[PDB]
Amino acid sequence: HHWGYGKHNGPEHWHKDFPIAKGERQSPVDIDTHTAKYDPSLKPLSVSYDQATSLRILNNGHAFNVEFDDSQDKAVLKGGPLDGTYRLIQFHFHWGSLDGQGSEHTVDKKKYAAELHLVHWNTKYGDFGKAVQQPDGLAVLGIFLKVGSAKPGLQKVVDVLDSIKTKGKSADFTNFDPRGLLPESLDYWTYPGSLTTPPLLECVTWIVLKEPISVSSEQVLKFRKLNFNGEGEPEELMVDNWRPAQPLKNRQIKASFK
Numbered sequence: 001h002h003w004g005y006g007k008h009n010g011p012e013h014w015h016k017d018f019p020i021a022k023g024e025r026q027s028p029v030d031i032d033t034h035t036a037k038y039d040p041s042l043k044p045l046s047v048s049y050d051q052a053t054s055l056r057i058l059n060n061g062h063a064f065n066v067e068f069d070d071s072q073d074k075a076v077l078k079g080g081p082l083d084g085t086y087r088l089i090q091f092h093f094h095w096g097s098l099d100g101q102g103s104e105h106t107v108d109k110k111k112y113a114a115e116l117h118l119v120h121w122n123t124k125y126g127d128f129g130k131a132v133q134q135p136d137g138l139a140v141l142g143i144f145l146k147v148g149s150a151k152p153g154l155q156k157v158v159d160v161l162d163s164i165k166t167k168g169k170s171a172d173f174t175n176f177d178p179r180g181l182l183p184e185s186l187d188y189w190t191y192p193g194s195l196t197t198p199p200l201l202e203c204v205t206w207i208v209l210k211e212p213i214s215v216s217s218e219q220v221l222k223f224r225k226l227n228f229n230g231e232g233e234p235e236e237l238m239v240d241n242w243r244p245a246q247p248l249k250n251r252q253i254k255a256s257f258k
């Protein structure tokens with residue numbers, strides 16, 4: 001009886017195995033745009049992905065992860081609210097059964113069709129497993145997806161999903177350039193939070209871009225053909241793999257922009 005996104009194991013149950021689910025800095029949150037404060041001391045984000053080395057794509061039963069070589073500074077996030085250098089380890093998405101839901105963060109209560117998470121760990125902690133034990137261990141760059149025009153840079157991801165339909169399947173996924181998933185603007189909101197899946201560790205500096213990317217209806221429809229189940233198990237479509245907004249508690253969301 002493992003955590004998931006079903007009626008019997010979804011977000012409202014997670015606190016029983018992961019009591020930090022009710023903690024002081026949980027994610028995601030609603031971003032109230034009128035209450036977020038412009039912080040003129042925030043720096044431009046530095047996204048340095050030119051030397052990124054993607055390796056593999058994995059269906060882990062919760063989402064699919066595009067994994068990177070993080071054994072050198074090849075794809076790094078710096079600047080913005082961050083002190084030091086954060087290395088890209090993987091990206092994944094959360095998405096809905098319907099275009100009207102799927103994001104984890106919301107903006108003035110608006111839900112997007114999906115949300116991209118580019119996950120980075122602080123190199124001062126040596127590896128990802130040590131980093132998640134620290135309050136400044138991770139930086140997750142979140143990008144909203146809306147349905148409209150296709151995102152050309154997403155199509156290579158979409159087209160490999162048939163090969164990783166079920167939980168535990170992986171495929172080679174080299175030479176994928178994550179720069180093709182970014183919007184034009186790097187304006188962002190930032191706040192201290194958590195992983196949005198178990199173990200829900202309070203180790204993340206969230207950086208959520210204001211500008212969504214557009215993906216086509218056909219691209220998100222292919223996300224919704226994935227399965228939560230393993231091969232040889234009853235088919236359950238991988239949809240609505242998002243945690244809803246959590247209480248903001250004693251936090252301020254800062255804006256990089258007026």
Ligand SMILES: Cc1cn([C@H]2C[C@H](n3cc(COc4ccc(S(N)(=O)=O)cc4)nn3)[C@@H](CO)O2)c(=O)[nH]c1=O
Nearest residue numbers: 067068089090117119128129140194195196197198199
């Ligand atoms: C590719 C790779 C993996 N691993 C280890 C660490 C991996 N892992 C991931 C997690 C949970 O992390 C999360 C949860 C939520 C978010 S969210 N939604 O953005 O908030 C973000 C990150 N916990 N452990 C584990 C399974 O992949 O295998 C490795 O050691 N080396 C590698 O090269």
Ligand SMILES: [Zn+2]
Nearest residue numbers: 092094117196
């Ligand atoms: Zn995520």
